[PDB]
Amino acid sequence: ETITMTLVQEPELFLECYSVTPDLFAGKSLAEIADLPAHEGKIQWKLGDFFKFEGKAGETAADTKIVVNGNVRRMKRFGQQMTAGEIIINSDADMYIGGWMKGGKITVKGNADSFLGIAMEGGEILIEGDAQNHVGSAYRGDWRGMSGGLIRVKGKAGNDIGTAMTGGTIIIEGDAFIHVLTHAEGGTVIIKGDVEGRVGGQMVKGDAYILGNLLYPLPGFKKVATVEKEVDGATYTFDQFIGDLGERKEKKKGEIIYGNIFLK
Amino acid sequence: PKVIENVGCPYCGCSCDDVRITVSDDGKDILEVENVCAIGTEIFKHGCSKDRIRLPRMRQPDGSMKDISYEEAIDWTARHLLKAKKPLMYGFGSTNCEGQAAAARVMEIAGGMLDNCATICHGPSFLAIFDNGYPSCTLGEVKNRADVIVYWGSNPAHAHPRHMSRYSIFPRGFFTGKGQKKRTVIVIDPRFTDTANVADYHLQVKQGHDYELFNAFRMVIHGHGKDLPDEVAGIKKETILEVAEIMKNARFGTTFFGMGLTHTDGRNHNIDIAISLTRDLNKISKWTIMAMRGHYNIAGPGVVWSWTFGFPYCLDLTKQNHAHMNPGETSSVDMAMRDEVDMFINIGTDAAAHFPIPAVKQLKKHPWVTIDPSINMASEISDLHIPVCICGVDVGGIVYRMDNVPIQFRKVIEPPEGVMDDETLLNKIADRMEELKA
Amino acid sequence: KTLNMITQRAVEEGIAMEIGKTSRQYFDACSIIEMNEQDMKELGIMKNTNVRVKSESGEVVVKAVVGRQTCYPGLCHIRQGVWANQVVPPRTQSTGAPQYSGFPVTVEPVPNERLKTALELVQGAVGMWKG
Amino acid sequence: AFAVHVNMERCTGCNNCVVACPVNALELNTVNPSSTDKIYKVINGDAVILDVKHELCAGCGICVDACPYDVIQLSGQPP
Amino acid sequence: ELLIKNGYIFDPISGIKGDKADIAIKDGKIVDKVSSKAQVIDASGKTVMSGGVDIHTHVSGPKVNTGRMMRPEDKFFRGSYRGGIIKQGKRMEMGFSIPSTYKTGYAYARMGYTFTNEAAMPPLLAPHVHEEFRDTPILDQAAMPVFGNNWFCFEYIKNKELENNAAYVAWLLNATKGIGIKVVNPGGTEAWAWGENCTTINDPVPYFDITPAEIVKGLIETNEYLGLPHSVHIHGNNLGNPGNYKDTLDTLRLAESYKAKNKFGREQVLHNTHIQFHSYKGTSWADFESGAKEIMDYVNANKNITCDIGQVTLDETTTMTADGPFEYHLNQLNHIKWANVDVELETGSGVVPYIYDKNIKVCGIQWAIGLELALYAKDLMRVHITTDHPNAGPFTRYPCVIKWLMSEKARKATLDTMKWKDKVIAASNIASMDRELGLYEIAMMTRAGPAKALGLAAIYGSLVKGADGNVAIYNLDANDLPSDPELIEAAFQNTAYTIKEGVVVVKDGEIIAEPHKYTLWTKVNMPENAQVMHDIKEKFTKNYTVNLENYAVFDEHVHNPRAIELDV
Ligand SMILES: Nc1nc2c(c(=O)[nH]1)N[C@H]1C(S)=C(S)[C@@H](COP(=O)(O)OP(=O)(O)OC[C@H]3O[C@@H](n4cnc5c(=O)[nH]c(N)nc54)[C@H](O)[C@@H]3O)O[C@H]1N2
Ligand SMILES: Nc1nc2c(c(=O)[nH]1)N[C@H]1C(S)=C(S)[C@@H](COP(=O)(O)OP(=O)(O)OC[C@H]3O[C@@H](n4cnc5c(=O)[nH]c(N)nc54)[C@H](O)[C@@H]3O)O[C@H]1N2
Ligand code: SF4
Ligand code: SF4
Ligand code: SF4
Ligand SMILES: [Mo]
Ligand SMILES: [Zn+2]
Ligand SMILES: [Zn+2]
């Protein structure tokens, strides 16, 4: 039902432990799990060379559940392409956590480096630390990126929030920095703090709820209405702005749809 | 007194090839150099020097630096490249395209990280190209057709000196027989640069607000420009409308950009909003963005590694059979910050001088090798300094201009007796590594 | 006081590096602040006098001059090189391009202090300053 | 027939004084070129005026207006 | 030095259908008899052909490098690499579409192909093409300079100087080391430099007042006068729009008064390429059907016109054509990336990703059109197989094309898995079509068609005596074709063996070695024209940024040339 991983040998460089997912851990013997591949530099380690396992995984990823209890703050690629199950990181983390995920949930109890939730397609993330930039951002050179799921960064976010976002939701309980929802097409972003600006640039469609204070509003948004909206909370009486008039707009049946950014 | 035509100046993105050298009787002293700018004149004057490095040089325990043979330096580098766990090879701004192919092969054998000056220079631009595209043109196109010229965040007068007199403004083309007098030049940057002196307009913008400026322009172009605020980025709405009207009426425009866009807030988003503006202008006119690449063959690593691995820069060659690229994770500066390297190889650049000093401090914890023709900061804080020929002066080859047009550079001086060139050197390193059987 | 700052090029600077990174020409060309005349008066900086440029990621003593390329009130400028990169912050914003232009900095008029050469700066940052 | 003086100390070799001079532009850019002599040519990185005896200049100011960092002084008074 | 004993032979140039013949390669060139010191190959029950020849493929050049830069999603997608993971050879293979040079070479070697004709190259950008060719691994390769928007060839076909234009084509070919002539969107690509396009065959170029018809005719006269190996490879006008089958017939009627004169064997006078792109019909994309019937009726009539199909392989791809207006129009349709590279005094360019997915009536009909073209051909020697890689799909989907041709079950399967099957079958004809091209026909239109059309069937494309020893052995037996079309897919995807001028380079589908390659060019020997010399010098002084002495590819930047020489 559960697996316990505990770091025993500290790796001098960063370990690309992509193999640590419920998908690879499901229905495997303890020795097999301990010998799943893991890279480091240009060398490939066996994943029993840096961890000590104690548990019994399930027949299915949707059954199993991994718990990492060490200083895994120099480990990258945890949760990659995780289809179902559960992961817990009782520390902080590094790059690509939950990348290209399609279900399940990652509960990082600490921070996180860049590229958290890159191109995610479902499931949950429950960070309580200060996630860096490119949270939910699509991979370089792509146009259809994040298309579902939930990201909950309970700390200070950074750049490139929800770049080229298509669906789903990115909630940042702290505040943010430049370039939120650029190139986007759909979904929501709920920032609950001060934003430097540049929010909604290049947007074709989508929503960006903000409860802090935009310090540099882009010229491409104009106020059109003051609406009450229950977003993650209750009636906050937002004054919506309409569309990025700088960028072309997709048209629906008999009406042009704008990418409306809200505000407090 | 043996005048040599059609030489290449190996410094700026212009890759000027209209250079005339009057080499001495013995073919090893350069007497007078015509048609080149000063920065170039000095490159040739340095290449033709009499007292120049000829052998490698190693750091002894005492801290001094003594010479060793080429085979010993190749052995040192090969053994270290194999023993390391994630070496990083950086540079390639100033090398022939065979120098950037041999390096790709060497690091394919090794398994480290291969990278160029694109990361710290116009790599934010490539990241935008990946997002939006690169509507561009060759430089003869703007020479022969351009009616409006925009220098957004660039300074040709001091970056690329003979850019204006060769490609953009002053030449009298085919459809621009009237020369400058029918070209409208707009220069945007917070300073009043020498390019702005020569220009006819100037949009003195607050440093860092170029995104708001581009968004204003694009709302004007998309048509309901009345919704602009009174002023944008320090620029006044009537001036915005003036420049936008000129841009709309341009028969064939061209936009150049540089550090004003690739080194400020929103590194790549500035460039991609610029590219979006260009794609929008091509609705009613013809407009072509174009990046002010710096070193001669800095577009050479891009194309060579494009054909070899498919990725222009930030190459993750550690899996040994599939490469990866993510600039935020695989770039030289970020890896130096997160001490994710094991060895730094200085090839065709000056990392010590031109990196942030925290990154240099983080990097020097490991061994450090420099392959340069002459003394510089990297060759002063390295562990061994392997000499190499200079492109365009001691050795010829292909280089790639600002616009990815291959110029063929010629050789004017034979290199000092003993000194080899980087393609021979990198090939010997790869041969020795295969001898060491890894 | 917050005094936003940029780092850029100049022909004399390019000329200097191709003379040599360790040359008096390079020293003269790069160890330079090119700020506004109004800002120089308001801060209290004598023209052509050393000054302490101290950002959050370092510090450097650099000559303070006025530049033809008119910086608007509230802007600074160092020709790129050893001295500028002693004070450039390394933040990349997950793009690999450090904040080479547009970082805040405070400026303190500190004459009677020498300028640090290029070798001294780099080899002392690393810990190799034999001389 | 005026006299132009180029401050060699701040000349960068930009060559925009050579390209922009309308007497230089006579050879290659005219139908049936009349005179093929040239005022400036950038030798060793600085603009050299071959028009030593001040016979071809016409005080146009295209070259003074062209140099990006003013370095060409035009004398309108007899040398 | 080698002999391939007891394998079925299919050599259309010698009319050989399933004979148990033996090929005795001897030092790169096929010879009748070799002694018992030659290492043998027991190819029993395996279909032997000759080393395939590809006539139209963009496997190099500035367009392709611009695509590789612009599109890094191409290599990496959804976490895993769509190019697959493999290091069979001494290097890497990156890229699903527009593969890196090391993947293109290895993938063709595994296909059996041995010659690839890189279609379009701007003449100014010749060192680029010759550099990528040095890095392609085993395939011999030639590139075709583009002469349909050159300003010098706009002047001469304006002023009616056949001799001067011929001297200029010979000079260009000798400089860029090309092998023929490609006209990409005659005239229109230059109007794109101002932002317009030549939407028909008759409208004049801006400021030049020459027309697509005049320029095509002038280049045909030049080509057949010089007797170049390959004909005038032609793109066409009004590409990618409904109703342009009329214009395609109008442009094909431009050859009705010429005869192919040369010392090489070719019956074409012009080669109309990706015709499934030129064979549309109707007004817009809602009243859009197939004109392949009319196009192939005209081609089945005329014997001096040879074609190739641009069959779409129904996947994700980047489309690179040397003409701007088509790519710009496509960008305005689908709102995805777009790259444009205008050359100076020469051509244009355009790179735009595109999704040929199965869930669109338009893409379904586009897929059906190429099959209708190929299955309406009475003579297959004149209709070849390409995909305009990557414009209609990557070349690693050639076996899918061959499966679709050779098995109607495959076509029924694709049409059934297609979304708007009712609309596609209503607006096409491929649903009810029995023809399954035979193995002889597929060998014909894959190996002999392209070689004979290129007019180099002497060395490539056949197993007759004296030819170049390039042989490709396949798994499938010629006596009974496989029941499951996936078997055909695999059989043509992976070759049992492959020999390059006598040296085995692929075994079981696994790369083995890479000896070397040739880069063919044309070596017209003729006295120079003072008039064209003067015009070229004047034009480089006034208009080109590069110099005349640095335009010609240096003698040391070409990789084992082996020219094809000519006279006068
Ligand atoms: N403060 C500040 N710093 C910056 C920037 C900024 O904007 N502000 N910009 C950053 C950017 S844009 C970059 S490009 C860097 C640029 O800085 P660099 O890329 O480091 O450029 P150079 O210092 O001129 O490097 C030239 C060295 O390569 C040698 N060389 C010449 N030819 C060859 C050859 O053929 N082979 C080999 N092996 N060596 C050769 C030369 O002798 C010389 O040693 O500056 C960066 N640093
Ligand atoms: N002599 C010499 N020549 C060189 C070099 C050198 O080091 N010395 N470096 C070479 C190389 S490596 C480079 S990459 C190229 C690049 O050189 P360029 O790309 O042309 O850029 P810079 O010369 O640094 O000047 C950039 C201009 O943008 C202005 N700027 C700063 N911030 C902003 C902003 O926020 N908005 C706007 N609109 N403008 C801003 C700056 O004031 C400056 O005027 O030059 C090359 N040429
Ligand atoms: S502009 Fe650049 S390439 Fe041209 S001469 Fe000057 S330094 Fe050389
Ligand atoms: S004043 Fe006119 S004619 Fe005289 S040198 Fe200058 S540009 Fe030439
Ligand atoms: S334009 Fe000015 S800087 Fe340029 S070469 Fe002439 S005098 Fe010198
Ligand atoms: Mo640069
Ligand atoms: Zn085509
Ligand atoms: Zn094609």
Automatic annotation (TrEMBL), chain A:
Gene3D superfamilies in UniProt: Glutamate synthase, alpha subunit, C-terminal domain
Catalytic activity: N-formylmethanofuran + 2 oxidized [2Fe-2S]-[ferredoxin] + H2O = methanofuran + 2 reduced [2Fe-2S]-[ferredoxin] + CO2 + H(+)
EC number assigned by the record: 1.2.7.12
Record's keyword annotation contains Ion transport: no
Keyword Oxidoreductase belongs to the record: yes
Keywords, ordered alphabetically: Oxidoreductase
A biological-process GO annotation: methanogenesis, from carbon dioxide
Top-level EC class as recorded in UniProt: oxidoreductase
Name of the protein: formylmethanofuran dehydrogenase
Species annotation: Methanospirillum hungatei JF-1 (strain ATCC 27890 / DSM 864 / NBRC 100397 / JF-1)
Automatic annotation (TrEMBL), chain C:
EC top class, as a word: oxidoreductase
Organism: Methanospirillum hungatei JF-1 (strain ATCC 27890 / DSM 864 / NBRC 100397 / JF-1)
MF annotations from Gene Ontology: molybdopterin cofactor binding; oxidoreductase activity
Protein name (database record): Formylmethanofuran dehydrogenase, subunit D
Occurrences of domain Molybdopterin dinucleotide-binding (ranges): 5-102
Keyword Oxidoreductase: yes
Transmembrane intervals: none
Alphabetized UniProt keyword annotations: Oxidoreductase
Pfam families: Molydop_binding (PF01568)
UniProtKB/TrEMBL annotation, chain D:
Keyword Lyase in annotation: no
Domain of life (superkingdom): Archaea
Binding, [4Fe-4S] cluster 1: C11, C14, C17, C67
Any GO molecular function: oxidoreductase activity
Keywords: 4Fe-4S, Iron, Iron-sulfur, Metal-binding, Oxidoreductase
Enzyme class at the top of the EC tree: oxidoreductase
Residues that, per the record, bind [4Fe-4S] cluster 2: C21, C57, C60, C63
EC number: 1.2.99.5
Domain 4Fe-4S ferredoxin-type positions: 2-31, 48-77
Full protein name: Formylmethanofuran dehydrogenase, subunit G
Native source species: Methanospirillum hungatei JF-1 (strain ATCC 27890 / DSM 864 / NBRC 100397 / JF-1)
Whole-protein residues included: 63 to 141 of 146
TrEMBL record, chain E:
Domain Amidohydrolase: 39-506
EC top class named in words: oxidoreductase
InterPro entries in alphabetical order: Amidohydro_3 (IPR013108), Formylmethanofuran_DH_asu (IPR012027), Metal-dep_hydrolase_composite (IPR011059), Metal_Hydrolase (IPR032466), Metallo-dep_Hydrolases_sf (IPR050378)
Residues the record lists as binding Zn(2+) 1: H56, H58, K182, D388
UniProt GO molecular function: hydrolase activity, acting on carbon-nitrogen (but not peptide) bonds; oxidoreductase activity
Amino acids binding Zn(2+) 2: K182, H235, H274, D388
Gene3D superfamilies xref list: Urease, subunit C, domain 1
Keyword Zinc annotated: yes
Spans through the membrane: none
Keywords: Metal-binding, Oxidoreductase, Zinc
Known EC number: 1.2.99.5
Residues modified as N6-carboxylysine: K182
Entries under PANTHER family matching the protein: COLLAPSIN RESPONSE MEDIATOR PROTEIN, HYDRANTOINASE/DIHYDROPYRIMIDINASE FAMILY MEMBER
Protein name from the UniProt record: Formylmethanofuran dehydrogenase, subunit A
